[PDB]
Symmetry: D2
Subunit: 91 residues, 4 copies
C-alpha cells in the first residue's frame, strides 16, 4: 500500500552506507539509537496532544510509526506483521 | 484497508456507553487515560526490543499503533492522516 | 536522611513475601514490572507539567524517584550512588 | 544537603544568560525542551536496566533526577517538595 513501500525501502538500505541516508545512519548506530527516537516521538505525541496542536500531533504520530517500522526492520520483521496483528484483534 | 475499518469502529463507539467496550471506557476516561496507554505501549516496545522477544515486540508495536489511533480519534482525526503524512515524506 | 531510610526499607523487604507489601510484590514480579512503573510515572510527570497541576507534578516526580529507587535496589545499588553521582557533576 | 545546593544553583541561573550555562539554555528554550530531556533520560534508564549496565543506570537515573529538578525549578517548585512528599508517604 504505502507502508509496504516504506518497509521495502527500509529493508533495501538496511545494510547500506552509514552516510547513504538517515535511515542508514540509524541502522549503523544500533538498537539504542532507534529506541531513543521511538521514545522521543512517543513523548512528543503526548506533548502535542496536550497542546491540542492537531497538526503537530499527526506529524509526531507519523514519526513514531515510522521509527517503529525502522525498529521492526532492525529485528528482521515488518509492517504487515503489525497490521495483521491489529486485524487478528479487532474484527 | 484494515486500519480504516478499525478507525471507523473507533469513531462509531466514540460516544457510546462507558461499559459498552474497552475503547468506549477509554474515551469516557479522557485524554490522560489514553496517553497513559500510549506511553505504556511505547515503553513495552523498548523492553521487548531489548529482550529480542520478536513476538512480544510485534504485539506491543500493534498495541501502540492501536492506542495511537484511539488518540487520533479522540482529537477528531484519523489513520489516513498519518498514512498520508507518511507518504508525503518518504516517496 | 530520608531517602536512606526508604532505601533501607526497600532492601529490607527485597526478598520478603510477595503479599507482604507493594514493594515486595514488585520485586517478585520482576525487572519489567518495575520499568513499567518508572515509564508510567515519567509520562505522568510530562502530563502534570503540561496541565500546570503543580500538586500532581510533585506527587508524580516523587513516585518516579521512588520507583527509580526500587529499580536501583533491584540491581543491588542504592540512592546514595545517585546522590553522589549528582554531586560529582554539579559542584 | 546536596540536592538543595543543586536546587539553589538552578534557581540562581533560572533567569541568567542563554549562553551562560546548559541549565540556562534549557530554561530559555522552554518547558518542552525540558520535558524532552526528562523523557530521554527515562528511556535511557530503561535501556540501561535491560543491559544490566549498572554504571550507566546510575548515571542516567541521576541525569533523570537532575532534569526533574530542572523541571521543578521551572515551575517555581523545588527538591524538598519531592523529598517531603516522599517522606509523607513511606514512614
Amino acid at each position: 500500500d504505502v507502508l509496504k513501500n516504506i518497509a521495502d525501502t527500509l529493508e533495501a538500505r538496511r545494510e547500506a552506507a552509514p552516510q547513504s541516508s538517515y535511515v542508514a545512519s540509524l541502522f549503523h548506530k544500533g538498537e539504542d539509537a532507534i529506541l531513543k527516537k521511538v521514545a522521543e516521538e512517543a513523548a512528543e505525541t503526548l506533548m502535542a496532544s496536550k497542546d491540542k496542536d492537531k497538526l503537530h500531533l499527526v506529524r509526531e504520530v507519523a514519526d513514531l510509526w515510522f521509527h517503529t517500522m525502522v525498529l521492526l526492520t532492525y529485528h528482521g520483521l515488518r509492517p504487515e506483521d503489525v497490521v495483521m496483528e491489529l486485524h487478528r484483534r479487532e474484527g
